[PDB]
Write a protein that binds this DNA or RNA. Structure first.
Ligand code: MG
Ligand code: MG
Ligand code: MG
Ligand code: ZN
Lengths: 130, 101, 213, 143, 55, 149, 134
RNA sequence: AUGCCCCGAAACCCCCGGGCUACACGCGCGCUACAAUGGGCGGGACAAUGGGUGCCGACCCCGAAAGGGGGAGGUAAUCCCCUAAACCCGCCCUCAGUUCGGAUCGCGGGCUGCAACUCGCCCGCGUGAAGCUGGAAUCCCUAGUACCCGCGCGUCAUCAUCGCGC
């Protein structure tokens, strides 16, 4: 219980596995996305992760495609996302494969509440507007 | 024989009866049988809409409606009459279609 | 349940094909010309009488009863305690279920006493109909509660309505059924027992009607 | 031969109820999974639960502990395709809530979006919250 | 190319796929039996399209 | 007499009885694990829920003629209780019915009219009317008015 | 010789045929004795019981209906059957008893539903929403 | 549609990602219930308005279910949507926070889409919250009308607790 096993297959046991034999080990949504092909932008992004995986492209990977499905290629490195105004780092670990990329870059600031004002109740609605 | 079948269909009711009686008479004057104009169900298209541009005030609606009267005539084929029903010169708000069986 | 009763064919124009209203006898001269007892095999009139003033004079008493149990209960006026709003599981339009519960009601009544169930019913609807009321009459500027007299038709309406509401409150969230709670009401009212609801309401109307003559 | 209180794998069950409802109490066995196991075991779902001799209890305990191998199909099981191994499993009371708890902790680790909602005790499946889900206490202004 | 930055995209569904044939707005457009107009223009052109109001 | 001469439920109950002896009708391998349509909540309760379905399917192609699978799924649907939302009508599954029709075909009671569904054979009419008469020869004792026809 | 009459009741039509026989009567093929909602079986036996078990045993009737529901077709059957019986026997001392018991057995019902109007428009012509001041 | 005043390399025109779906809280209109005037399981009955060529799909065959692979006939009184639900008969439950009530959550299978995490809809197994008839107040209805039960168009690539009709 220190190694990670997804469906009985270790990381480097599945790291060399294919992409059509892979999808039988993912839930519906990701199996279907892997079956209607990848979008053009995600092609352009995989063709920048693989270079950054061999020896080249030692430069921060950025993106707008929050839809990309994490895969056994991306385990280990640290890529960015775009949560609306800025690029936020997501250090990819195992136990993320299957989830969505944008799933880890939240998008609305947590809310903390002040105090009710003029109109929050029927006792301060017409007693203010004269 | 081969029992041509003619199908008239128009929105003004009066301007249909006159072409119907033209066909009836033409058939009668010559020698041929005929099945009188068989009325088929009217097809009325109905469009419900709101009435005001903005959203203020109560909600009151309209009911626009357009009715299309149809007929059907069965007749034999004699060139003396098959031709006689070609100079019939339908009005502009009527449709005619001819076909044999 | 038995296939002889599930499939039942009459050969006489009686009430429901079972009981005959030829010997019942109304005592009160006031309510005699309003409680109809003609042959009328089937109790269903399809609501034609509710169009004409004093139309409901010529409608069989069993139909007047069946119609006043097609309802949900007490929906804006508490009855012996609580509201009893029971929507979507009330029998508001289901006349079949009403006719059935009244059939079984009579079948129980006929067994525990031994009389033509409609005679017991016509006894129940006189020992439960009161003939004094109250109002407010404004006179020269002011009003005040005064006592009045109740015409017969309204007596009959109030009688049947209170019988309905009396039975329809002991079948409520309680083990006893509805057809048998419609019997433990008529056997009581027809005997002037206090434990009833239709009779007690008559007494507590006549009391506060007399005490302010 | 009659009895009043019997027990199978933890929770103990009444003895005056039908067999299919008596098993409902065990956290992890609903009603549609009870009919199944009673059928597969080989005895009616209408017999009085007190009339269960004990070898049959042994049978039932066998079935509830790996039901896929006795006929219970793998589309009707508490959880299929276990996240640690593709085996198809059916858990019960003690093992169940722990499995759910660790399936929640796993989402808490990676800091997903579906883990933070579990953290702060809020909706999880995309509801709206301007108007409902008022699990708090009123606030005043002035009077 | 300066013709690649003022040119739109060819949609084929969604509110932005159709516009009124006479006014030019997206939104509440009538698609019954084919004609494609606003809800506002159909109301002040109908009695010339043939329609009538009976009830 | 025919099947037009008695109520439906009694005849179906009596038919499902003799049906248990035809070696072709027998329940499939997934019968104890199935509810009959997306609109139910619980599984069937009796043990011979198969024979009732099949027997209701015979009398249903006797007096309905050429009828097809996707029309026997509208008949066996119902109203659904879907939580906090209103009720709604839904069709039924397919396997429980397709198997019934194939088994009745192999028995010898129906046949596949091409392009138009299935209809009943002479063997099937004999089967059903014999039982209808057998029943009615006793529904007239306690109902002495059927004696006419 | 044969007769045939009609009866309509809020979208339900009934065609009857009367002729000599053993006293049986069918409805869509069902025998009258087998109609389950008893309140709809006692509804079509009122003409055939108000005439007596003598005329009821020298005719055969056989009706066909379509539309409506279990109680809007029973009444169609009743209207057609009364109008047929008042011609086969063709008397009037029986036609009279068909007006004291129920006048509509021969004149039918002229009532139909009423269209809906725009404030709820799915509940009825006169039922509306709930007012909200404040 | 339009007068006057401001923008005029911008407040004009396109493209990618976010928001309008945020939540201590007050309110308007509704849907489901608090059970026997009922819950479940198996059988038996009967409608009308409307719509379809970018589309409606009978019939056959795979699947437990959502659905999938073929595919007649239809430019319409012809072919299709389309064997409605409340109702009835038979068996289980017997007044209990329950075989009532199904919110909230875990895992697995699918459809539409160029794209389903933020934020789509549908299925199977499991867990089983408040709720035991509602304070002062207030709303709608006069006859095939009120109440109770389902259906069809619109919006629509998919999604109806809504609007308008039956
Ligand atoms: Mg908004
Ligand atoms: Mg339940
Ligand atoms: Mg989503
Ligand atoms: Zn326009």
């Amino acid at each position: 219980r220190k190694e990670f096993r997804y469906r009985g297959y270790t990381l480097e046991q599945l790291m060399n596995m294919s992409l059509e034999e892979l999808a039988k080990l993912l839930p519906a949504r990701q199996r279907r996305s892997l079956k209607r092909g990848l979008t053009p932008e995600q092609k352009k992004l995989l063709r920048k992760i693989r270079l950054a995986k061999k020896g080249k492209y030692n430069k921060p990977i950025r993106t707008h495609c929050r839809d990309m499905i994490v895969l056994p290629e991306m385990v280990g490195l640290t890529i960015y996302v775009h949560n609306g105004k800025e690029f936020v780092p997501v250090e990819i670990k195992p136990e993320m494969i299957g989830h969505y990329l944008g799933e880890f870059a939240p998008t609305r600031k947590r809310v903390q509440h002040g105090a009710p004002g003029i109109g929050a109740t029927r006792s301060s609605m017409f007693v203010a507007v004269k | 024989m081969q029992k041509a079948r003619i199908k008239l269909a128009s929105t003004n009711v009066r301007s249909l009866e006159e072409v119907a009686n033209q066909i009836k008479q033409i058939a009668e004057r010559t020698g041929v049988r005929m099945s009188g104009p068989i009325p088929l169900p009217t097809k009325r298209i109905r469009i419900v809409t709101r009435k005001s541009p903005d959203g203020e005030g109560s909600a009151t609606f309209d009911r626009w409606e357009l009715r299309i009267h149809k007929r059907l005539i069965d007749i034999e084929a004699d060139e003396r009459a098959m031709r006689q029903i070609m100079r019939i010169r339908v009005p502009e708000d009527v449709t005619i279609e001819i076909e044999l069986i | 349940k038995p296939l002889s009763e599930r499939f039942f064919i009459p050969h006489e124009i009686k009430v429901m094909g079972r009981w005959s209203t030829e010997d019942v006898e109304v005592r009160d001269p006031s309510l005699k010309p309003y409680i109809n007892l003609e042959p009328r095999l089937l109790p269903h009139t399809h609501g034609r009488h509710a169009k004409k003033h004093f139309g409901k004079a010529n409608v069989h008493i069993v139909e007047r009863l069946i119609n006043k149990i097609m309802r949900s209960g007490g929906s804006h006026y508490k009855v012996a305690g609580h509201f009893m709003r029971r929507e979507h599981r009330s029998l508001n339009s289901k006349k079949v279920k009403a006719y059935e519960v009244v059939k079984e009601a009579f079948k129980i009544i006929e067994k525990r006493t031994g009389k033509n169930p409609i005679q017991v019913l016509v006894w129940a609807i006189e020992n439960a109909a009161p003939r004094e009321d109250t109002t407010s009459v404004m006179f020269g500027g002011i009003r005040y509660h005064v006592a009045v007299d109740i015409s017969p038709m309204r007596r009959l309406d109030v009688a049947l309505r209170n019988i309905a509401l009396g039975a329809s409150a002991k079948c409520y969230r309680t083990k006893m059924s509805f057809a048998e709670a419609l019997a433990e009401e008529i056997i009581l009212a027809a005997n002037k027992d206090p434990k009833s609801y239709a009779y007690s309401k008559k007494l507590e109307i006549e009391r506060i009607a007399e005490s302010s003559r | 031969d009659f009895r009043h209180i019997v027990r199978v794998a933890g929770v103990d069950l009444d003895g005056n109820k039908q067999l299919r409802w008596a098993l409902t109490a065990i956290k992890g066995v609903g009603i549609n999974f009870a009919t199944m196991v009673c059928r597969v075991a080989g005895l009616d779902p209408f017999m009085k639960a007190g009339y269960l001799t004990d070898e049959q209890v042994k049978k039932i305990e066998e079935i509830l502990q790996d039901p896929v191998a006795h006929g219970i199909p793998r589309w009707a099981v508490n959880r299929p395709k276990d996240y640690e191994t593709g085996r198809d499993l059916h858990l019960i009371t003690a093992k169940l809530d722990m499995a759910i708890r660790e399936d929640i902790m796993r989402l808490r680790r990676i800091r997903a979006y579906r883990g933070i909602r579990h953290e702060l005790g809020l909706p999880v499946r995309g509801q709206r919250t301007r108007s409902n889900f008022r699990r708090g206490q009123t606030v005043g202004v002035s009077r | 190319a300066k013709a690649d930055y003022n040119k739109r995209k060819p949609r084929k569904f969604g509110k932005g796929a159709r516009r009124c044939i006479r006014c030019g707005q997206y939104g509440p457009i009538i698609r019954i039996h084919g004609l494609m107009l606003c809800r506002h223009c159909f109301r002040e052109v109908a009695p010339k399209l043939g329609f009538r109001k009976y009830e | 007499a025919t099947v037009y001469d008695v109520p439906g439920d009694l005849l179906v109950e009596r038919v499902a009885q003799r049906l248990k002896e035809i070696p072709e009708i027998k329940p499939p391998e997934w019968a104890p694990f199935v509810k009959t349509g997306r609109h139910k909540e619980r599984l069937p309760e009796q043990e011979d829920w198969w024979y009732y379905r099949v027997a209701s399917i015979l009398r249903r192609v006797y007096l309905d003629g050429p009828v097809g699978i996707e029309r026997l799924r509208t008949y066996y649907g119902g109203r659904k209780n879907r939580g906090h939302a209103p009720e709604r009508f839904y069709k039924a599954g397919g396997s429980i019915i397709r198997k019934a029709l194939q088994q009745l075909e192999a028995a010898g009671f129906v046949e596949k009219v091409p392009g138009k569904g299935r209809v009943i054979t002479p063997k099937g009419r004999s089967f059903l009317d014999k039982i209808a008469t057998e029943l009615k020869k006793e529904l007239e004792e306690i109902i002495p008015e059927l004696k006419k026809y | 010789r044969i007769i045939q009459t009609t009866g309509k009741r809020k979208t339900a039509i009934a065609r009857a045929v009367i002729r000599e026989g053993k006293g049986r009567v069918r409805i869509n093929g069902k025998p009258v004795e087998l109609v389950e909602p008893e309140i709809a079986r006692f509804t079509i036996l009122e003409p055939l019981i108000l005439a007596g078990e003598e005329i009821w045993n020298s005719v055969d009737i056989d009706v066909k209906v379509q539309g409506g529901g279990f109680m809007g077709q029973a009444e169609a059957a009743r209207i057609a059957i009364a109008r047929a019986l008042v011609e086969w026997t063709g008397d009037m001392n029986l036609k009279e008893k068909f007006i004291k018991y129920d006048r509509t057995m021969l004149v039918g019902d002229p009532r139909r539903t009423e269209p809906h109007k725009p404030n709820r428009s799915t509940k009825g012509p006169r039922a509306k929403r709930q007012k909200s001041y404040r």
